[PDB]
Amino acid sequence: LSLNNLQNIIYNPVIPFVGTIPDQLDPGTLIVIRGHVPSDADRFQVDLQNGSSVKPRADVAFHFNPRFKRAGCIVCNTLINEKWGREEITYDTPFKREKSFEIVIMVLKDKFQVAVNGKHTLLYGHRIGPEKIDTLGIYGKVNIHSIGFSFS
């Protein structure tokens, strides 16, 4: 599906990345993240955050965490009031070490949908109102090639 009109593009960002999202994540908006993990990576994470506070720890509406140990998985969760919720684990994962990915996170009314390299990966229902997200965090052993946004 369509990745047209990507704006505010950043190439080769330094990791850890913590950036202000340039507009509100309304239903229909998307975030596109391209990258790969190196051969010594076990995991990395993308977080859609309310702010960038370290203490107290900023709330994370959507934590998306591929883990590469043996057959692999993706863990999704939410952090509210400095506490992690109950994780949702997806075992059918497209991620592999040294294999590049295009992650598309699309905000829908009731959930996020995530696709990788043009194929559906998972769904994650909203636990925090998406209007409260203003910060993108990327952490861990990951080489990010680019970040872009679609708001139009």
Quickly count: other Cβ atoms within 10 Å of residue 136's Cβ.
24
Answer yes or no: is 102 a known binding residue.
no
Beta-carbon contacts of 11 under 8 Å, excluding residues fewer than 6 positions away, are 145, 146
Nearest of 18, 33, 10 to residue 102 by alpha carbon: 33
| Residue 107 near residue 30, CB atoms below 8 Å | yes
Per the CB < 8 A criterion, the answer to whether 12 and 144 are in contact is yes
Q: Are residues 48 and 62 in contact, defined by beta-carbon separation less than 8 angstroms?
A: yes
Q: Would you say 82 is a known binding-site residue?
A: no
Q: Which residues on adjacent β-strands are paired with residue 88?
A: 76
According to the entry, how was the structure determined?
A: X-ray
Q: How far is CA 33 from CA 11, 81, 126, 127, 141, in A?
A: 10, 27, 20, 22, 15
Alpha-carbon span 143 to 20, nearest angstrom: 19
- Return d(Cα 59, Cα 134) in angstroms, integer: 11
The phi and psi torsions of 3 (rounded to 5 degrees) equal -105, 45
End-to-end CA distance of the chain: 15
Spatial CB neighbours of 140, under 8 Å, sequence gap ≥ 6: 15, 41, 43, 44, 45
3-state DSSP call for residue 104? strand
Consult the annotation and say whether 87 binds a ligand: yes
Closest C-alpha among 12, 31, 15 to residue 107: 31
C-alpha–C-alpha distance, residues 2 and 5, integer Å: 9
d(CA 1, CA 137): 25
d(CA 120, CA 133): 23
All structural domains of the chain: 1-152 (2.60.120.200)
DSSP state of 43: B
Would you tell me how many other CB atoms lie within 10 Å of the CB of residue 127? Answer: 15
Q: Which structure tokens are listed for 110?
A: 């009731």
What backbone phi and psi angles, to 5 degrees, belong to 25? Answer: -80, 85
